[model samples]
Target: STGSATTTPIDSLDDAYITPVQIGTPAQTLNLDFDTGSSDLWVFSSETTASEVDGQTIYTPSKSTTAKLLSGATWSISYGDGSSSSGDVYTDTVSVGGLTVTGQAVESAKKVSSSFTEDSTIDGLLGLAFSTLNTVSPTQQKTFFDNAKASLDSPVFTADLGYHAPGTYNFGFIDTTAYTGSITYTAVSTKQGFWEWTSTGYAVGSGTFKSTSIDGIADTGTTLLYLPATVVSAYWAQVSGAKSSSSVGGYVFPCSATLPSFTFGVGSARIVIPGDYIDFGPISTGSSSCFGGIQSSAGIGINIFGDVALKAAFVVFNGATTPTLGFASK
Candidate 1:
């Protein structure tokens, strides 16, 4: 059966969205981040160190009769941002919205990085990326989506990430009512286990569209949009007083700066990111300086169209034969 779930922004951190999920028999509910960048379903659990637990909820296998340890199996993951989690594995019933996977692999985290330990609200992460990225050792695991795809009417899911607002993550079907206009589809390259695609070019403000091609990934886990250093410099040049702040470590400008819109070409369609959204809130509370939502992907090797860019449009992660990406005005 098809399913849909509401995604809510974190209270203090407006960057990531979380959805409710139930795991194991007699299901224990947890709020998880549905990340499209990685493939590993892990959760804070009783196995976690006490100090790392903090205010986060922990999953207890003893409470779930159907939970079974995957003997001799373990998993670990380190994100590009240095965030990490690792632990033993268990197979159990995992459910999201109205969809259920009877024997889904659930990594029980015994350790977590400072980034995750501090963000107590995020109990775990539900990976939506290709199964090839799963971190389980001895035998890699399949993602919840992979296990449930065969039963779905169609192997497709849509991401409607909103700015400081609630959004919807619909599975097995796409709701045309959630977006306006038609979706422009683009072929995806999943060689790296990411929803990688190429954008024909981009333009700063209403300037001439550059013919430069950019290869990037649509990552829901990442908060900012990362592009080539040269491209970032070009966009910053249009905003007066914008500078690469040594203190802030990225492009920053006066909070009152009149930012210009940025546009990226998706086949014949153009997705424009508003100027206001470029000013990612403020560098600090009550500060007159603001950090840019778009930054350089110098060290990362590949550009990332993170939440900053994805929120500007309706995104569809098509899991058909060859994965594809569809974008449209939200």
Candidate 2:
């Protein structure tokens, strides 16, 4: 399903949002919600009301001399998950690690009802996830990736989530320290904003499902992995002493003791999700009980592999060099 937004010629403003990163530093750290459906960086700014945000860090663009505001520009975005944020455009001297990019594009919102406001770990989203589900459109704004490509080392940008902790989101070069050798890579198709795929089958603990015929999408904007109902039920059944708990989100189970390991196969490429993801604590009451790694999507058509699943591998969304997503070793 193409969530929202239309395809257009790659505009310069679109490329400006896709900034390159040296990675690893507090000043250089930026939140990216790389949604193909929408194009913009929504960071909580110092001017935002404290009551509107919870545990997240607000960006102080005033602290950077290179920052500049885009006169008369504004944006509002709503997602299929019911997340939304809107604000004015601004540019700041931005640095990713030691790679400083002057006049980097940014956004400051007066309001953000998105679930992301609750987390302090990430200042804001770097919208790399793209599905037509995004409420914003190119006619309204260009994406961060599309706008920032000019300064990047290569059109190639890699996300290495697996090598770090379960929730750790890394950018720029793929981390080679964690995995053995190189990864079996796949090229992302650019038919739409969504990163669609077909799965061969799934596995949990020692038990495995033989249904290799399933199609879904991977999205970072989503906080948890959404899966087919059949795939969801089959995997959850393997958790030891697992019982459906109403207090946690419907997806949460009681197998906190010995969480299982899971793997999914797409052609010859196999992605492994560790136990930490299986033992995740639910962020809220009545929310789907999440394994931190995987959760049932309640039959949501798009199977979103949130940050937990993404942190496990080096992901490259190459929009400039090629209109494709590349997976490399982290």
Candidate 3:
């Protein structure tokens, strides 16, 4: 059977996107962040300490007839931003859009870091990354997409991520109407359990496009684009007041500064990110300084094309054959 799902952005343009997912026998709906950076279907649940849970919804597995505890099984995961969660595992029915998996492993969080508990609106995370990255103990679990791929018309999913607007995650099919021009396909290197790709070159503003090779991951869970220090420094140099600030943590510039466009090469396609999008809002509310959306990924070791960059194009996560990526202008 074929299925499709729509995603809604949280308050800001590049924070996160939430999608509805059903868990357990009778179907309990939870709003989950569709994360492509990692693999692990986890949720805040009744097992979590009441004091730790604020306004977040909890998944009560005891109430579901299909829920079965995986004895002695536990999971723990840490994100690039340092947020973490750990808890027991349960096998239950999990469904997204109209696709359902009968024995999906659902990690019920007993402990969650402040970053997750503070963001109560996001009840859980639906991992769309490769199944090998799953955190379940003993036998690794497959993602919702991995389990459902066999029955789908095609093993492909497309992400239409938007800026301050609603987007969609279409399963089993590509909505050609959502994009313009032709989709440029590129080979993906999955050695690191990420949608990793290489860029042939990049340029700032209207300057001549320089030729260089850069390796990075396409991560929907992250908020900003992270590149190498040299690449980040070069881009920020074009902005008159840009500087690396220890207090602000990344490159910061005058909010009133006019920014330059940044473009990267994917195969033969040139994806251009507008200057306005590069200015990732003020460092804080009512502040005169703004944080650069594109920052150095030095500490992290790998570059990340996060929401800031992904929102500029329509991305296709092709699970068929070679596991490729297709991009096109929206």
Candidate 4:
């Protein structure tokens, strides 16, 4: 999350809330994905020689004007999807909405493959998560929060997913107007970077739910919302004509039918998972149905709420101001 300052309000994707940032002082107005799962700022560079990253966006050094590489600090990152990229460190002028910071570290990857190369729109990922996962290490793991904390209007950052529904993700500076009043904050358990918690039960629909208990971690990195077997079976039972098949290696159900609604117990707040979110697709050998929300794990620590659930609300990881998560409406 830590990066250079900004002078003007940078533009973003039609459905995204993004800001322009400089990589290494003069400034490169590159559009990057503000990811909360990891901590680091990486972009494709024109200097790359490999053909693996042919279709990906590569930052042009000439456009940076005053960019400077960090000399020796370089990295190679691999994701769960088996995609990876390697690059060197560089400093340049970074800009975001209304503010511009100088001499910020940026990763200019020369080699990218799999998902990294296939992603057509996104140029890079700007990690806004905790500093613990930072590639910089224990001595220096400051993210955007560390550098821009004092300058931010309220020292708050909010991720609004439901703003455009489904695959839409919006980041940067919390929109205070979304909160009805005070924010309900949930203290984050100090453990790994992943935000883990337990769910008391599933909210079937409105007030109906199965008398089953589920525990899981709230992860943004993953795509599917995985749960225990018993829980998954029980919830799908409520569907008028839900049938289970394997697609994406998980439970797949037919389309057109309304899926059951569920919610997770995070402290006193019970966040609801919309029925449409449970609608799965790709049900055949080449086509699959949505698992909707499946229960696949056993006992506790079984569910992993991926992006499907998080994309429904305005979530604020209030690590900078409070040791808690602030949830609000967008």
Candidate 5:
């Protein structure tokens, strides 16, 4: 069946979005980060130490009749930031929106990162990327999307990420009313277990669209639009008082100065991110310097079209035999 869910921004800069997920038999609701960049469905649980719990919600598998321990299974997810959480696995009934998945692998965090512990807004993450990236070992688990694709009206889902407003994650069907023109589809490579695709090129402000192949992943888990250094420099160069600051990280510009809009091509379609979207707020309280939402991905070695760019269009993750991504102007 088809279903829909609302994703609310956690910060004014739209650092992350949280969606309410119902886990276990009695439906323990927790605010979760829906991340397409990851493959494991994990959450803060009773298994986590009390000190690490902070103010986040914790899932207690013992309270759910459907909970079943996945004996001998364990998982650990590491990030580029040099932090991770290792945990045991359990199978439980997981539901999102109105869609449900029986025996979904529920990774219970035994220890959470201090950064995660301090962020009371998010309980855990639900990955929408390919199941091949799943972290569970001995018995690699399929992502919720993979497990529930069979029963869905269609093996696809759509992300309507918003700038400063709540967006929707639509499953099983494309809501024609959500977008403007026809969707401009592009081939996707899940070889890296991401919704990776190639964009035609990009432009700064009113400049002409440059014809080039820019490969990147559409990552909902990331907050910024990370591109090759060359593209990033081009965009920042247009700003009058912009500078790449090591102390501030990435490019920072005068908060009072105007920022040029950034645009990227998806096949034949063009998605424009407003200038204001790039001017992420001040670097520090009362500071005149503002950080940018678009930065160089050179260090990361992977270009990422994160929420900053995704908010400009409607994105579809097509999970057919050969996966493809669909983007439409909205």
Candidate 6:
């Protein structure tokens, strides 16, 4: 079977992407963030504390005839951004873009951090990464992709993310029309439960492609692109009046500066991220200084090619036992 769905940006800043998902038999629809970086399908539910609700949609397992509590199961997840959620587990019918998986493990949140509760844009997250990353205790659970892989025409999915506009997520098959030219493929190592790959090198604007390689994960859940401090500072050097200010952290420069384009290599193929897309909006509302989407990952311990880079191209997450990733221009 195959399925497709449109993923809409949660806001003008393109901070995150959301898609509608139906849960349980009665089908409680919720706008969920489809994250390829983590492996935990958790949602705000009736079990969440009232003070933590904050107007976002919540799923009620009690309402579904097929819902069954996974008696001894519990799960907890925490992101580097400080957002965290934890709760008990339930098995129920879950559907995303018509791809149904019966008795799928659904983590129902009983507690969440301030950031998770404050932002009502997402009711939950559908983790598309490897199931080995699942945080469920005692009884490890499989991700939705793992559960549905057997029924899919091909055990693969594609992400066509747009800049500000709605993008598409196609499962079981690739829409050749969604991209231009051929997709360059690379081996993805899931040793750490991430879609980790290495880029041949990078270039500033139309400059020469540096031969240095970088190992990073293609993380759709993350908002910005993070590289080594030297590489990040090198890009910032091309901009005028750019500095990492204490008042407003990160590499910020005058909005008028001519930000240069960024290019990264995948084998012999190179994907270009336009200069405008690198300008991550202003430091504040109507501010003259703007933030750069590409930042330093030195302190974070690992590099990440986040939405800032993903939005620039078509990406494929191949789910075979030995997974691979594909990229192409759109």
- TM-scores of all candidate predictions against the true structure: 0.97, 0.73, 0.97, 0.77, 0.98, 0.98
Candidate 1 local lDDT, 1-330, one digit each (tens):
788999898864467899999998798999999999999999999999888887887889989999999999999999989899999999999988888889899999999999999997899999999999999999999999888888998998889988778898888998989999999999999999999999888999989988778999999998889999988999999999999987888999988889999999899788899887787767889998888988999988889999888988999999998889999987
Relative to the true structure, how large is the alpha-carbon lDDT of every model?
Answer: 0.91, 0.54, 0.89, 0.58, 0.92, 0.91
As for model 1, its CA RMSD to the true structure in angstroms is 1.2
Ranked by TM-score from best down, the candidates are: 5, 6, 1, 3, 4, 2
Best by lDDT: 5
Residue 14 CA displacement from its true place in model 6, Å: 0.3
Higher-scoring candidate on lDDT, 2 or 6: 6
Instruction: Tell me the lDDT of model 2 at 173.
Output: 41
Predicted candidate 6 versus true structure: per-residue lDDT over 1-330, tens digit per residue = 988989999998888999999999899998899899999999999999889999789999999998999999999999978789999999999988988999999999999999888888999999998999999999899999999998999999898888989999989998999999999999899999999999998999978889888999999899899999988888889887998876786889999998899998888899999988887788889999998899989788899999989999999999987899999999
RMSD of each: 1.2, 8.5, 1.3, 5.1, 0.9, 1.0
What TM-score does candidate 5 reach?
0.98
Candidate 5: segments with Cα more than 4 A from true spot: none
What's the lDDT for candidate 1? 0.91
**Residue pairs with backbone overlap in model 6:** none
| Best-fitting candidate, scored by TM-score | 5
What does candidate 2's lDDT look like per residue over 1-330, in tens digits? 001111111121111122223211235444444443344567777766677778665677666555676777777877766777777777665544333444545767778874657644445555654423333333244344444456555554555443222222233344456455566655555456666556667777666546575555656555456777777777777765555555655556553356777777655666677766555554454544433346666646566665555555556566554455554434
Q: Which stretches of candidate 4 lie over 4 Å from their true place?
A: 1-27, 136-141, 163-174, 179-182, 195-201, 207-218, 240-247, 283-288, 291-303
Against the true structure, candidate 4 reaches a TM-score of 0.77
The TM-score between candidate 3 and the true structure equals 0.97
lDDT of 3: 0.89
> Alpha carbon lDDT of residue 47, candidate 1?
93
